[PDB]
Amino acid sequence: ASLIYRQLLTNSYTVDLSDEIQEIGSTKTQNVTINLGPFAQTGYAPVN
Amino acid sequence: SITRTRVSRLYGLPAANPNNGKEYYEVAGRFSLISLVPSNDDYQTPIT
Structure with missing residues (x-):
């Protein structure tokens, strides 16, 4: 009975x-390549 | 000036015939500009 x-x-x-x-x-x-990465702390120009 | 009139030695561009026979007035140069253009480089593509 070890045949199983x-x-x-x-x-x-x-x-x-x-x-x-x-x-x-x-x-x-399927998934895509994603970025955590470095991201720059970029603001706008000084406007008037 | 306008011969046969009192208008003499006036300074300015008269709008009668500004082109003065020339096909076009041309100015050459360079110019640089900043933008916030989009890109990934190269993320968001399929994993394979």
Whole structure:
């Protein structure tokens, strides 16, 4: 009755294509490069 | 001046024929200007 453990370990490659299924089924979302960076404390010219 | 009249040795540009036959008056030079132009350099693009 250890055949479950043995077959699970053996057939663990199927999880990869199961993840593939769940991925191609689920939605997608990608992000962009963002900046925190240095930002200058820039005001306006002295106007009249 | 205007011959046959009392208007003599007046200083100024008369608006009768200002162009005086020339196709155009031209002036050359350089000029520098500051602006607040937009850019990212190069952020907000996709991560890949």
